[PDB]
Design an enzyme around this catalytic site. Sequence first.
Site, mmCIF file in Angstrom:
data_model
loop_
_atom_site.group_PDB
_atom_site.id
_atom_site.type_symbol
_atom_site.label_atom_id
_atom_site.label_comp_id
_atom_site.label_asym_id
_atom_site.label_seq_id
_atom_site.Cartn_x
_atom_site.Cartn_y
_atom_site.Cartn_z
ATOM 1 N N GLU B 44 0.816 -1.225 0.000
ATOM 2 C CA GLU B 44 0.000 0.000 0.000
ATOM 3 C C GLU B 44 0.846 1.270 0.000
ATOM 4 O OE1 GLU B 44 -1.507 -2.567 1.774
ATOM 5 O OE2 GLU B 44 -3.702 -2.313 1.577
ATOM 6 N N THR B 45 0.337 2.281 -0.686
ATOM 7 C CA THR B 45 0.803 3.648 -0.610
ATOM 8 C C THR B 45 -0.340 4.501 -0.096
ATOM 9 O OG1 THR B 45 2.385 3.395 -2.419
ATOM 10 C CG2 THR B 45 1.661 5.579 -2.022
#
EC number: 5.1.-.-
Lengths: 295, 295
Positions: B44-45
Site C-alpha cells: 500500500e501507498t
Amino acid sequence: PQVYHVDAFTSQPFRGNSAGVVFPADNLSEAQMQLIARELGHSETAFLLHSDDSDVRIRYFTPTVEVPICGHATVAAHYVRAKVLGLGNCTIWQTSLAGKHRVTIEKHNDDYRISLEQGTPGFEPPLEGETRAAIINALHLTEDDILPGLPIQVATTGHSKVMIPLKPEVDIDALSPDLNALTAISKKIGCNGFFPFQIRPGKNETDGRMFSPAIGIVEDPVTGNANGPMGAWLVHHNVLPHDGNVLRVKGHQGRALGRDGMIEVTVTIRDNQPEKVTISGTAVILFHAEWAIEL
Amino acid sequence: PQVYHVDAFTSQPFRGNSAGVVFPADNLSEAQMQLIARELGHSETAFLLHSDDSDVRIRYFTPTVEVPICGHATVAAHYVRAKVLGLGNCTIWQTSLAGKHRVTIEKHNDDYRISLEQGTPGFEPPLEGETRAAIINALHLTEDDILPGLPIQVATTGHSKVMIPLKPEVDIDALSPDLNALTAISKKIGCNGFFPFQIRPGKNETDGRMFSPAIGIVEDPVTGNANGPMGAWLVHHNVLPHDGNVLRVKGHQGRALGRDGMIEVTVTIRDNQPEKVTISGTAVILFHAEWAIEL
C-alpha cells in the site's frame, strides 16, 4: 549514498521498465545489497561500484537473488551515472558477473541515450511437430496466426528466448496464455522465456510481449534479451529489408501492461548473418534521495 | 509533492511492513494516485489530503486497486506527518473510505508511536466439520496442534480474518501452507485471510502469520486487521487473564519473512467482552524525496 528510481526504455514517467540504482555500493555486503533490492521491490536494482580495472562495476539483484547483467537495469544505471557525473558522448567499459561490456553514452539536448552491445548471436534448431503446436496452443492461437514460412525458434545474444513470429492481424494485447503449459514447455526445451512479436506494416518496427512464468515473472515490460535476439533473427531469416550492412529495428513492448517502452536494436551484418547486436534506449528519473538511515 | 519510503511496525530498517507515503496529494487524480502506487510497488501507498470534516484525509492504494483503509499504511502516514509537522502528543481524527477513525500520536525520545482505534469487534459462528478439517490440513497440521476447546472462526474489527489458535508448541515459522487449498477455502467461506497465531508461555504476547493467497498476497509481514481481532478474540474467549478493564497484548508477526514487526494491541473490556480495540506501532523512514517529474 543515494537511491534513484528510474523508468528505463522510455522518457514517459510510469512507463517502461522500472529499476533502482544505488551508489556508491562500496562496503555494502552481498547481504545488504540483497536486502535493499528486496526493500525497493523492482525487478532489478543496480549497485554501482568503484573499479580499478574498469570505469565501473555493476552488481544486479532481483528482490531474491543476484543476477548477471540486465539490459534495462544497465540503461538505468548508466543514465543515472551520466546525469550525476555530467558526461557527454563517451564510451564506458563496465564489469559485472558476466565479464566486460561496451556501453555508449549519447547526449542530445540535455537528455541521454545509452547503448549496450550484447553477446554473440546464436540460434538453436527450429521447434517442430508437437513442441511447436504446444507453444502455439499455449497462446490460444493456431498455425494460421504464425508468419508464413518462418520458424518458432530459440534465439540468443546471452540469455535465450523463444521467437514466435506472428501475423500483423493478431491482437497481441489480447493474448492471455496458459502459464502452466508454458512453464512445462520451458523445462523440456530448456528456455525460460517466450517472445511473440509482430511487425508494423511497412516499417522496420515491432510489437512484442515476453512471458517467462517458469522463473516467476509472468510478463516483463521491456526486455533487451528478447528484442536483441529478435533483431538478429530478423537478419538471419531475411524478414526485413536493409540498406547498408546494418538493420535498425524499433522494438516496442509493454503496451498491454500499461508500461510502453521502446528499444532501438542495431544489428551489424556480415555475409547476411547477424554479427553484433546493440540495444539502445533512454530513461527518466522519477526521484532520487540520500538514504535517511546508516547503511 | 514528496514521496517517503517507510517501514511500519518496526524501528529496524528493512523489517516490518513497508508502505509509501505521498503528499500533498490534493492536486492528483485517482488515476495518477493509482499509477504512483503501481510504480512504488508497496502493498500500500497512502496519499495525504486536506480534510473538510477531520484533521486529515488519507487514500490508500495497492499496486492495482484503491482500498478503504490499512493499518501499516496508516501508521506510516501519521508517522511521516508527525515528523514533517513537528507534532507532540496529539489525538486526531482522520477520514477515509472506511469512515472516521481516532489516531493518537505519542512522542518519546525524538521518535513517534502511532495508535489507531479500530471498528467494533465481531465473531462469526465457528467453522466446523469439513471446513475446519480443510483449514487444518491446508496448514499441514492436525487437530492435536490447535489450542484445546477453542474455535477456528472469522473475526473482525473492520476487515475480517480467520482466527486459527495454535498451541505454543507448534513451529509457526515452519508453516508452508497449501496456498491453492487456502484460496479455494476463502471462496467458500467469504474471507480472504488466515491468521494462525500462538501465545508465548506466561506472557501477554503472541506470534502470528497472515496468509491471503486469494487476493495475490501469499503472506503479509504485519497485519493490523488480524492482530486487532486476535486481541479481541482473546478477551471474548477468556483465554488470557486481565484486571477486567483492559488487556494489552504485544503481537509479533513477520519473523519467517525476515520482516519482523511488532504491534501493540489494547482492548478495553466491558462485561467481560471486548469493547474497543486500538493498535499501536512505530516506524522508520528509509528515505524521502521531492518528485523530479511534474505530476
